[PDB]
């Protein structure tokens, strides 16, 4: 329950990093997942929704700089941790009912393992495309 | 000689051995350590069928992964197929990272010295970024006026075409101007002045390059008086 | 026709070409191409290694799951001879 | 002369760790790995003369394990325990010294390179393709 | 250099000081550092074993490089910008059509 709470908080969050950027064009930045919100300026708390659009030399199918972005600005590996985590929480909740088959709670912990396996990948790709 | 602001060098701190990686890598290796060992535990104790036959547990596995990571060997090996096929991955994982570690620590333990900018005044003729001047009513300023070496000629050209005045009125004026220009205004004076300014607090100045010529201080008398030969 | 050859003979053309192309080396690579920085390893360099690590974890776990699947429920010494003859 | 834009500095990709050694050398590594493990399997389990066959513990899969263990600097628990498999194993040890010491010579230079891409040089794709204009 | 040669005359008339000192060393030579034909100096450098350098023009240099036995080598860069041309007597009618 604590892990599910902390992971859902960390997903539902605009405060992960702090850097110097802009708020809304066309500054110490209260930056998070997609809402690159900001503070300490002309206005404080206008959360621009960000995605990918560079102005490059037209990389055509540069996969390690394109598919990486596709996994970055659509969190699938971070969001799947919540899915597996509550999926295993349902099984540890369903331990009591339908019991005395000595098999079901083995299936539960696999979700808890694999969710952290998704989490570590999400952290790696987030730091990767921050410096990307 | 040429005097500039000394760039502030960085000192190696206490934990100056964790340098050839970054803190992201240091936390990711901890995370992966935990995950690899717990997956090895999960694959070991899984009711194979009797049960206490295999030797692995959480604790054994925790220090097995560490003894595989740092090259210190082990006491036991995975014997099940999936245990071997997960241990080989960790074996491949260490051989990249610790090799990168030693090979880059070999790079950090060779050089610590700065790259030494605009030395020997030729880039002072070449670039347009950092300005420079002399003392007005000065023999050095007259020397660059009358000089005929072409690099000195271009330096005199840049000094006479100045926006604003690169020239100053007294020595301490140019001292403070270089102390506040942050590497954007060089300064020309004489070597004794330069080393005296170096040997004072706050030591924020620095002599670069070599010398340029051979001048000399003397005693000056009016022409024709009787003091000349006894002095 | 006689003057241009004097300039070519005395290198005045070389001096002017150096003045108006090479003494104004300003932007980037001409000045900074012969310097050196040591290193600092970032995570963007080493990412596929972690990728291989995590993928191998998943593969090993899948192997054990189908092992427990099979042992919950070569062959014919004999036809091994067939197998090795067709292999030869 | 042909003027085009500046390109962007292509940082090295995912499978760049195996970069300092050429693919042919990796191929010969895999072949030698298989061959050494199989020959070491052949030396044992060769009717050793009630233990007349299980004198050693080297199965084909145990030898496959031992070779890979010896290659990457962590020796396994078992040892060849008899002659003539060991003048395989010592040669394999000499091999794994000389190879990976050559591997880890300048590895850090191979993970920060950032070379350029240069799409066209002697133009002629300005004849061939229709994409990039020129005037 | 080559005798009766434009390069030898160029080092005679040259006024850059490094070229002046080179001309000084060439005119103060024991024995003659000068040669009469091109292949003479080629063989002299092929037998001097790195004790006698040679000056010629870049096209000659790359042609000697692209032949057997390839024992020669061009070093450094260039020095100036000369040019081959067609030569006519002064005032004839062939000048402008050529
Ligand atoms: C497992 N055990 C206890 C049976 C053997 C001891 C481990 C061997 C430790 N050597 C690690 C290496 C050191 C240098 C020379 C080579 C290549 C690398 C640099 C890594 C080997
Ligand atoms: N001794 C020099 C100092 C100033 C300078 O070098 O220009 C003078 O009196 O002129
Ligand atoms: N083209 C030159 C060759 C000899 C030299 O360079 O001195 C000439 O005819 O004079």
UniProtKB/Swiss-Prot annotation, chain A:
Assembly notes: The L-type calcium channel is composed of five subunits: alpha-1, alpha-2/delta, beta and gamma. Interacts with the PDZ domains of DLG4/PSD-95 and DLG1/SAP97. May interact with GOPC. Acts as an auxiliary subunit for AMPA-selective glutamate receptors (AMPARs). Found in a complex with GRIA1, GRIA2, GRIA3, GRIA4, CNIH2, CNIH3, CACNG3, CACNG4, CACNG5, CACNG7 and CACNG8. Interacts with GRIA1 and GRIA2. Interacts with MPP2.
Coiled coil region boundaries: none
UniProt tissue specificity: Brain.
Clinical disorder: Intellectual developmental disorder, autosomal dominant 10: A disorder characterized by significantly below average general intellectual functioning associated with impairments in adaptive behavior and manifested during the developmental period.
Full-sequence range covered: 18 to 162 of 323
Location(s) in or outside the cell: Membrane; Synapse, Synaptosome
Spans through the membrane: 1-13, 74-94, 104-124
Role according to the record: Regulates the trafficking and gating properties of AMPA-selective glutamate receptors (AMPARs). Promotes their targeting to the cell membrane and synapses and modulates their gating properties by slowing their rates of activation, deactivation and desensitization. Does not show subunit-specific AMPA receptor regulation and regulates all AMPAR subunits. Thought to stabilize the calcium channel in an inactivated (closed) state.
Top-rank lineage group of the source organism: Eukaryota
Family: Belongs to the PMP-22/EMP/MP20 family. CACNG subfamily.
Protein name per Swiss-Prot or TrEMBL: Voltage-dependent calcium channel gamma-2 subunit
From Swiss-Prot, chain D:
Transmembrane segments: 23-43, 83-103
Segments on the Cytoplasmic face: 77-82
Covalent lipid sites (S-palmitoyl cysteine): 76
Expression triggers: Down-regulated in the pyramidal cell layer of CA1 in the hippocampus by global ischemia.
Compartments where found: Cell membrane; Postsynaptic cell membrane; Postsynaptic density membrane
Annotated intramembrane regions: 58-73, 74-76
Site features described as Crucial to convey clamshell closure to channel opening, chain residue numbers: 120
Tissue and organ expression note: Detected in forebrain. Detected in dendrites of neuronal cells. Expressed in the pyramidal cell layers of CA1 and CA3 and in the granule cell layer of the dentate gyrus.
Domain of life the protein comes from: Eukaryota
Effect of residue 73 to R: In RNA edited version
PTM note: Palmitoylated. Depalmitoylated upon L-glutamate stimulation. Cys-76 palmitoylation leads to Golgi retention and decreased cell surface expression. Ubiquitinated by RNF167, leading to its degradation.
Assembly and oligomerization: Homotetramer or heterotetramer of pore-forming glutamate receptor subunits. Tetramers may be formed by the dimerization of dimers. May interact with MPP4. Forms a ternary complex with GRIP1 and CSPG4. Interacts with ATAD1 in an ATP-dependent manner. ATAD1-catalyzed ATP hydrolysis disrupts binding to ATAD1 and to GRIP1 and leads to AMPAR complex disassembly. Interacts with GRIP2. Interacts with GRIP1. Interacts with NSF via its C-terminus. Interacts with CACNG2, PICK1 and GRIP2. Interacts with GRIA1 and SYNDIG1. Part of a complex containing GRIA2, NSF and NAPA and/or NAPB.
Domain notes: The M4 transmembrane segment mediates tetramerization and is required for cell surface expression.
Entry similarity comment: Belongs to the glutamate-gated ion channel (TC 1.A.10.1) family. GRIA2 subfamily.
Note: The postsynaptic actions of L-glutamate are mediated by a variety of receptors that are named according to their selective agonists. This receptor binds AMPA (quisqualate) > L-glutamate > kainate.
Protein name listed in UniProt: Glutamate receptor 2
From Swiss-Prot, chain E:
Annotated site residue numbers, Interaction with the cone snail toxin Con-ikot-ikot: 12
Gene: Gria2
Tissue and organ distribution: Detected in forebrain. Detected in dendrites of neuronal cells. Expressed in the pyramidal cell layers of CA1 and CA3 and in the granule cell layer of the dentate gyrus.
Modified residues (Phosphoserine): 14, 48
Lineage: Eukaryota, Metazoa, Chordata, Craniata, Vertebrata
Subcellular location: Cell membrane; Postsynaptic cell membrane; Postsynaptic density membrane
Quaternary structure and partners: Homotetramer or heterotetramer of pore-forming glutamate receptor subunits. Tetramers may be formed by the dimerization of dimers. May interact with MPP4. Forms a ternary complex with GRIP1 and CSPG4. Interacts with ATAD1 in an ATP-dependent manner. ATAD1-catalyzed ATP hydrolysis disrupts binding to ATAD1 and to GRIP1 and leads to AMPAR complex disassembly. Interacts with GRIP2. Interacts with GRIP1. Interacts with NSF via its C-terminus. Interacts with CACNG2, PICK1 and GRIP2. Interacts with GRIA1 and SYNDIG1. Part of a complex containing GRIA2, NSF and NAPA and/or NAPB.
Source organism per UniProt: Rattus norvegicus
Stimuli inducing this protein: Down-regulated in the pyramidal cell layer of CA1 in the hippocampus by global ischemia.
Superkingdom of the organism of origin: Eukaryota
The protein's name: Glutamate receptor 2
Residues shown, of full length: 670 to 767 of 883
């Amino acid at each position: 329950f604590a892990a599910f709470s902390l992971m859902t908080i960390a997903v539902g969050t605009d405060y992960w990093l702090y850097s110097r950027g802009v708020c809304k064009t066309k500054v110490m930045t209260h930056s998070g997942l997609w809402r690159t919100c900001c503070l300490e300026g002309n206005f404080k708390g206008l959360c621009k929704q960000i995605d990918h659009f560079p102005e490059d030399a037209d990389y055509e199918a540069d996969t390690a700089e394109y598919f990486l972005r596709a996994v970055r600005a659509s969190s699938i590996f971070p969001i799947l941790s919540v899915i597996l985590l509550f999926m295993g929480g349902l099984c540890i909740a369903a331990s009591e009912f339908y019991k005395t088959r000595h098999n079901i709670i083995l299936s539960a912990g696999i979700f808890f393992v694999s969710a952290g396996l998704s989490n570590i990948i999400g952290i790696i790709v987030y730091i990767s495309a921050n410096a990307g | 000689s040429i005097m500039i602001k000394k760039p502030q060098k960085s000192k190696p701190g206490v934990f100056s051995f964790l340098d050839p990686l970054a803190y992201e890598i240091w936390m990711c290796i901890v995370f992966a350590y935990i995950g690899v060992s717990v997956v090895l535990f999960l694959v070991s104790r899984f009711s194979p069928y009797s049960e206490s036959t295999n030797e692995f547990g959480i604790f054994n596995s925790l220090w097995f992964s560490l003894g595989a990571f740092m090259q210190q060997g082990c006491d036991i090996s995975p014997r099940s197929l999936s245990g071997r096929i997960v241990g080989g991955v960790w074996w491949f994982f260490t051989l990249i990272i610790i090799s990168s570690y030693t090979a880059n620590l070999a790079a950090f333990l060779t050089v610590e010295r700065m790259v030494s900018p605009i030395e020997s005044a030729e880039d002072l003729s070449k670039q347009t970024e950092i300005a420079y001047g002399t003392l007005d009513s000065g023999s050095t300023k007259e020397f660059f006026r009358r000089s005929k070496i072409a690099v000195f000629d271009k330096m005199w050209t840049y000094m006479r075409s100045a926006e604003p005045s690169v020239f100053v009125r007294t020595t301490a004026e140019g001292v403070a101007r270089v102390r506040k220009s942050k590497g954007k205004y060089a300064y020309l004076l004489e070597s004794t002045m330069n080393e005296y300014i170096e040997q004072r607090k706050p030591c924020d100045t620095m002599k670069v390059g070599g010398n340029l010529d051979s001048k000399g201080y003397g005693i000056a008398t009016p022409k024709g008086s009787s003091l000349g030969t006894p002095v | 026709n006689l003057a241009v050859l004097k300039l070519s003979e005395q290198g005045v053309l070389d001096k002017l070409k150096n003045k108006w192309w090479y003494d104004k080396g300003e932007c980037g690579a001409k000045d900074s191409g012969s310097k050196e920085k040591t290193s600092a390893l970032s995570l963007s360099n080493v990412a596929g290694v972690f990728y291989i690590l995590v993928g191998g974890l998943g593969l090993a776990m899948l192997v054990a799951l189908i092992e427990f699947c099979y042992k919950s429920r070569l062959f014919d010494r004999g036809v091994q001879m067939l197998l090795t003859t067709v292999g030869a | 002369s042909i003027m085009i834009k500046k390109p962007q500095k292509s940082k090295p990709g995912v499978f760049s760790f195996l970069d300092p050694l050429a693919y042919e050398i990796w191929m010969c590594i895999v072949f030698a790995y298989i061959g050494v493990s199989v020959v070491l399997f052949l030396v044992s389990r060769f009717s050793p003369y009630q233990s007349s066959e299980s004198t050693n513990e080297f199965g084909i899969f145990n030898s496959l394990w031992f070779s890979l263990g010896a290659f990457m600097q962590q020796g396994c628990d078992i040892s060849p325990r008899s002659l003539s498999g060991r003048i395989v194993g010592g040669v394999w040890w000499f091999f794994t010294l000389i190879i990976i010491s050559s591997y880890t010579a300048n590895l850090a230079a191979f993970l920060t390179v950032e070379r350029m891409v240069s799409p066209i040089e002697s133009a002629e794709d300005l004849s061939k393709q229709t994409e990039i204009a020129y005037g």
